[PDB]
């Protein structure tokens, strides 16, 4: 059974992605950085849906640790057919007010996390000889920029550049590589949503997960190199 | 049962869209300009799947005829929950070589067609009080341009602008409005297969169902937060 | 002989500012208007006082055969145009259900019929100069992103972008660059809405748009083609 | 006189930018990582053009060293009115074949370089109370991605997002912030020349001044309503 890894799937959008993929019939490996009990709960819910699941715990920034965990996981359970890079991080503030840690942790969590998670997994995916699916989670801010988020905008835009480049490299292997860029998602804010978003509301996590689930499906086999915005018309 | 009109659904991409929407559980109205026998065949295939279906024949450029046919159809069968504007036209040629007919017929079929079909249908859709779905079919050419296709590029680009603007107007009524922009799709048919191997990252033309599946997803209840978008289904071309 | 540029809709507004800047850059500039002949002649006088040759042409860009006859005769008398700026445009705003047939048709055709009707008689005279060339279309932020009450105008301005990009591909081998300038909200004749919605907190001035067109028409912009350049104060 | 810092301006695109800005009437501070003699030659050319100039030497990745050099320079010569961030590095290779150094050096040179150079300079620019100009140099690869360049594409795409976000924060100060994305620029074998002939609509690589002229326009007073933009100078590539 084809297996998909979803980073940051203990709660929020990542959890909703993991559950939709399980309902689609994929085996789903859960992941979290520190919330082991939440990850275990999602694992139980996936197993209740009739699919195999377990969790892995790592900070996507710990390069050598992520490699050891993923290589051991692929040896024990086979290569991943799909990977969803969902875990991200914000440290908001005006650009001259950002600290070094504000900047570095935000950039690396996205861009080093891309390298650290996917580099060990590309050849095991290719070796399944059945195509594959990679989906990254960016943001409206990675497309357009946002005040107080020069670091987050850079990180999520860089994720887009990496995703499009990787799509070109993996296309001949029938592996599609796409990005989903959510808008404002519910995880006086309702008044801002009423005023600024054409649909007049924040998105729900399943409205994002549905797009990821579609891209991971066999039906989406001619969609690659794309950034798909799920943002209620914001841009 | 929610009903969806698919223009140009007698064959090709539009037929695949129509069959996929029927399989998702929509009643589907088939449309063609002149190929009535193929339209009748698609209607029968949709009926055989367990959904209601009939066909409408019109040229989308005949503004007053289209209005009369659609108003009578809505009177008889209720408002459309969805409209997929798939019917299109090319007349390729270098810009100095294009004739008036080459230019006018390509621009109008996309832009007159958008107006002529949607204008009679907006209020019947809103009156359903359950949201709605509008999907237009553009092209990679409407995003980036293409040699020999200044007319088609303008026509398909103009469809993107109209789609995005209408998305803004209809969002408060829970009607999403999106565009699907295919790349090179195999609709039938050695040179064009080698051209696909070199130019397209996936190294092949797309199949009609690979376009129809994206349209089907956008028409589904699960795509309720996607609007104002151009979704490219092009094998990585751009 | 001096390179000559046609600016449609240059009797007033953005098109006038474009014509004056192109004259100051040393082009001969031909002024055009649909009906405001007195204003066209005043722009011609200013271009002449600026030191360049100028005259005006009057036509509705939708009158395909009349446009063809006027442009053919003008090129016969004065030579091919090195540049063409398609600036003249038209809005008929309103919610989509409120638009009349005329609201829709006049807006679509003024941009897309105008593109075809003005450029078809001029492309070969431009190519036959054998010195490259410049074509610039005026779109809008609405043609990129859409705007409420402007389904017709967004379609018209987005269609212009597609035409521009495709023609850039066809003409690149002749060293004719083809680009689009997409202004945001420009002051030509609300002020509080500008302060709230535009990062620069103000409307643009006509010369801020004209400066981009002038730059694209310059010899220095020889490697820029197929582009949509937004002049919008940060709006998108 | 308004002063502009151009990073990596001892040769190539950066040198062409520095010279064009001096001819436009700006004082221009040259920069290089190690090529000290080349930097001094550019300084002398700018002085001969009639503007004030000197050079600064640093690796944009050396965060605290850059901060100390720039703080001292602003102390001695005043805040910069403009900054042109020309800081990039490639380490090409198939993605699963990239080393840690291939990845990290490319990401950091662009994104650490943005932070390390611009953070010390934002407040001194604002304190001029005269507006300002920031231009970053990206690449067509940062817009569409490129095979063998997952690292460079991510680096150059991250620069675009940082630039757009910073444009939003500084717009109220009349500081415009824009990105220039060159295509293939002649900075050449027979193979490279032939690949330019076929991929690029203009059928040639760009020259350094064709890029510098766009930077120079953006830095001019006339470009005062252009901000948050990525302007591609690529011969029609995309
Ligand atoms: N095929 C491709 O590679 C690509 C296609 N597209 C777009 O996808 C859509 C479908 O592509 P394709 O499958 O080629 O279908 P076509 O674009 O070939 O149009 C075929 C359908 O449109 C109908 N049609 C054509 N002109 C009119 C008109 N004036 N009034 C009413 N109906 C009309 C035809 O009716 P009849 O059967 O009676 O002739 C037929 O049902 C089009 O919008 C096309 O531009 C975009 C990118 C690539
Ligand atoms: N002003 C703004 O805020 C913005 C404008 N734009 C675009 O910039 C361009 C100029 O804008 P603006 O300065 O407002 O001027 P307009 O767009 O109102 O066009 C005015 C000029 O176009 C001419 N014109 C109008 N219709 C026709 C026609 N059918 N045939 C021939 N000439 C015609 C007028 O001629 P006469 O003088 O005889 O009437 C006048 O010279 C347009 O393309 C517009 O869409 C885009 C974004 C914002």
Q: Which residues form the domain of A232?
A: 1-235
Count of other CB atoms within 10 angstroms of residue B115 = 23
Residues of C in contact with B97 (CB under 8 A): none
Experiment type: X-ray
* Residue with tokens 């997994």, as numbered in its chain: A121
CB A231 within 8 A of CB A198: no
* A225–B201 C-beta distance less than 8 A: yes
Residue nearest atom 4 in ligand 2 by C-alpha distance = C186
Task: Give the count of domains, chain A.
Answer: 1
- The CA distance from C160 to the nearest CA of chain B, in Å, is 6
- The CA distance from A20 to the nearest CA of chain C, in Å, is 31
Residues of B in contact with C153 (CB under 8 A): 165
Of A94, A145, A168, the CB nearest to D145: A168
CA angle C17, C19, C21 (to 5 degrees): 70
Residues of B in contact with C100 (CB under 8 A): none
CB D100 within 8 A of CB D23: no
Identify any residues that bridge with D185 across adjacent strands, giving them in sequence order: D206
C145 in A contact zone (CB under 8 Å): yes
D199 in B contact zone (CB under 8 Å): no
Of C208, C218, C230, the CB nearest to D224: C208
Chains that touch B (3 or more CB pairs under 8 A): A, C, D
Residues of B in contact with D238 (CB under 8 A): 144, 238
Of D122, D145, D148, the CB nearest to A96: D122
Resolution (A): 1.8
Q: How far is it, in rounded angstroms, from Cα B80 to Cα B169?
A: 18
Closest-lying ligand 2 atom to the alpha carbon of residue C62: 29
CB A42 within 8 A of CB A18: yes
Q: How far is it, in rounded angstroms, from Cα D93 to Cα D103?
A: 10
Q: How far is it, in rounded angstroms, from Cα C231 to Cα D228?
A: 10
Q: Which residue on chain D is closest to B237 by alpha carbon? A: D144
| DSSP letters spanning D105-164 | HHHHHHHHHHHHHHHHHHHHHHHT-S-EEEEEE--HHHHH--TT-HHHHHHHHHHHHHHH
Strand order in the sheet with A3-6: A55-57, A27-32, A3-6, A82-85, A132-137, A175-182, A227-230
Q: How far is it, in rounded angstroms, from Cα C84 to Cα A53?
A: 64
* D111–A107 C-beta distance less than 8 A: yes
Residue ranges lining ligand 2, Cβ < 6 Å = C 8-9, 11-15, 33-36, 39, 60-62, 87-90, 110, 138, 140, 183, 185-186, 188
B58-62, Cβ contacts within 8 angstroms, sequence gap of 24 or more: B58/B31, B58/B33, B59/B33, B60/B7, B60/B33, B60/B87, B60/B109, B60/B112, B60/B113, B60/B116, B60/B117, B61/B105, B61/B108, B61/B109, B61/B112, B61/B113, B61/B116, B62/B116
Helices (H), chain C: 13-24, 37-49, 64-78, 101-127, 141-145, 151-171, 191-197, 206-217
* A162–D147 C-beta distance less than 8 A: no
D202 in B contact zone (CB under 8 Å): no
Instruction: State whether the Cα torsion B163-B166-B170-B172 is positive or negative.
Output: positive
Of D174, D217, D236, the CB nearest to C226: D236
Burial of A90 (0-12, 13-18, 19+ CB in 10 A): middle
Q: Which one from A55, A81, A152, A222 is the annotated catalytic residue?
A: A152
Which among B9, B18, B33, B144 is the best mutation to test ligand 1's pocket, defined by most ligand atoms within 8 Å of the CB? B33
What crossing angle do the helices spanning B36-48 and B12-23 adopt, rounded to 10°?
20
D115 is catalytic: no
* C159–B165 C-beta distance less than 8 A: no
Residues of A in contact with D169 (CB under 8 A): 94-95, 147-148, 150
Residues of C in contact with B123 (CB under 8 A): 97
* Residue with tokens 């090319």, as numbered in its chain: B90
C161 in B contact zone (CB under 8 Å): yes
Closest-lying ligand 1 atom to the alpha carbon of residue B59: 30
* D155–A157 C-beta distance less than 8 A: no
* Residue with tokens 């790349």, as numbered in its chain: B183
Count of other CB atoms within 10 angstroms of residue B14 = 27
CB B15 within 8 A of CB B22: no
Please compute Rg for chain B using Cα positions.
17
Structure tokens at C62: 């939708």
DSSP state of A202: P
Q: How far is it, in rounded angstroms, from Cα A27 to Cα A80?
A: 10
Q: Does residue B181 sit in helix, strand or coil? A: strand
C26 in B contact zone (CB under 8 Å): no
Of C142, C157, C165, the CB nearest to B144: C165
Q: Does residue B129 sit in helix, strand or coil? A: coil
A180: enclosing H helix or E strand:
strand A175-182
Residue nearest atom 34 in ligand 2 by C-alpha distance = C9
Q: Which residue on chain C is closest to B124 by alpha carbon? A: C97
Q: How far is it, in rounded angstroms, from Cα D221 to Cα C233?
A: 14
Strands (E), chain B: 3-6, 27-32, 55-57, 82-85, 132-137, 175-182, 185-186, 206-207, 230-233
Q: Which residue on chain B is closest to A228 by alpha carbon? A: B231
């Amino acid at each position: 059974t084809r297996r998909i890894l979803v980073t940051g799937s203990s709660r929020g959008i990542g959890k909703a992605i993991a559950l939709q993929l399980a309902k689609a019939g994929f085996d789903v490996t859960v992941h979290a950085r520190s919330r082991q009990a939440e990850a275990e709960q999602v694992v139980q819910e996936i197993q209740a849906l009739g699919q195999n699941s377990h969790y892995l715990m790592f900070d996507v920034n710990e390069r050598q640790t992520v490699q050891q965990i993923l290589e051991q996981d692929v040896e024990q359970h086979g290569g991943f057919y799909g990977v969803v890079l969902n875990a991200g991080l914000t440290h908001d503030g005006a650009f001259p007010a950002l600290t070094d840690q504000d900047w570095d942790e935000v950039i690396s969590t996205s861009l080093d996390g891309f390298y650290n998670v996917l580099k060990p997994l590309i050849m095991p995916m290719i070796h399944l000889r059945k195509g594959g699916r990679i989906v990254t989670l960016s943001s409206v801010s990675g497309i357009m920029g946002n005040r107080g988020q020069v670091n987050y905008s850079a990180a999520k835009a860089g994720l887009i550049g990496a995703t499009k480049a990787l799509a070109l490299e993996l296309a001949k292997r029938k592996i599609t590589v796409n990005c989903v860029a959510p808008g404002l998602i519910e995880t006086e804010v309702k008044e801002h949503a009423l005023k600024m978003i054409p649909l007049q509301r924040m998105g729900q996590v399943d409205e994002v997960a549905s797009v990821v689930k579609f891209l991971c499906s066999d039906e989406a086999s001619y969609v690659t190199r794309q950034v798909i915005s799920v943002n209620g018309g914001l841009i």
